[PDB]
Subunit: 95 residues, 5 copies
């Protein structure tokens, strides 16, 4: 089952893994539409832990990058932060 | 079993996962023949949900990119949209 | 068990998956030795179907690229076509 | 379950796999914030063995790279060394 | 269990998979330290078969590349050849 999520830039965006039925496999991060040349980073913060940079995407150089991440119900607060002004599309599959 | 699909640009193209016997693993997106330098994106729309950018391919820079996507019979309407004028070949395997 | 195959350019080259004992996992395509700068593409044609571009390799920029392809005995005619004049080494493992 | 670790540069940093409940899958190395252009390498030393370079990251060119590494309780001393002055965020999942 | 091997350049280097307890997963090839700009290739020769190029690494452009290779006890003679003067670190995990 295909899975997708657009994580908007600016204000950091929360995400709830329990919304989906099964485990989320984040296998790709794709840069959204935009005009800024600045490097874009998506950071994942679990609970009160410090954010961990999932990947770095370079506009016009590397606009997509493979990922291998698994999100389940165990980490109750999942909070995605995106640097820059371009959205980052996370794609993958369920279970 | 090898699987392949050429998703044409321009008018967005529907796809029916039930045509194949088993689950489709989309493990690669390869840029088709063409002369345009513009960045090419393939977007996947499931049902009425907003399209999610699967990957971004740069002509003459990144003409192929690994993917890890699984398509099955559960998502009845699967609709592939390709930006640009170059076709995008999706390759992988069944089951 | 390691698996490898050099697919020569020019005249398109047939391949028989039944030669090996188990399923072939094509996990990498590496550009062979050569002097041409042109982009090299390996296309896979199964039966009478149209060729599907497996990957695109750029000399001096991207001379290798990860793949995730599975070839078994079910597809009787497997026919590899390579664009350019550089051979493409397919590497992986069996079963 | 998401896993993350920031490996600081400079003095080499020890890591204890037994802290986590399950096996650690290091599936990505992402360059941390910084201004240096020099290439950054994270080296893994197990026991008394010589360090093995896990990956090389180029600032402003390749700031993230996929990995497939599994760390468990069997290797008691695990010692991460990072070259350069930029931290390297290791991300993945447990078990 | 982490696995690592430094394959030296120059004279081609033999390797014995039976030294390790379990199957070797070669999931990454990282360029070693060096000053040469020439492209570096690691070739795998099994038995009397012709060498198959595992991957091609470009200094200062692509110093690491993901791999998916499995080496076991079945291929008795495994012989790694590295082009160039830079060593290539193979990293992965056992079993």
């Amino acid at each position: 089952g295909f899975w997708g999520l657009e994580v908007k830039p600016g204000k950091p965006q929360a995400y709830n893994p329990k919304n989906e039925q099964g485990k989320i496999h984040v296998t790709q991060a794709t840069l959204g539409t935009g005009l800024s040349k600045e490097k874009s980073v998506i950071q994942c913060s679990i609970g009160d832990k410090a954010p961990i940079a999932l990947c770095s995407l370079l506009p016009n150089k590397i606009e997509c990058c493979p990922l291998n991440l698994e999100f389940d119900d165990d980490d109750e607060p999942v909070e995605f932060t995106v640097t820059g002004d371009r959205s980052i599309h996370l794609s993958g599959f369920l279970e």
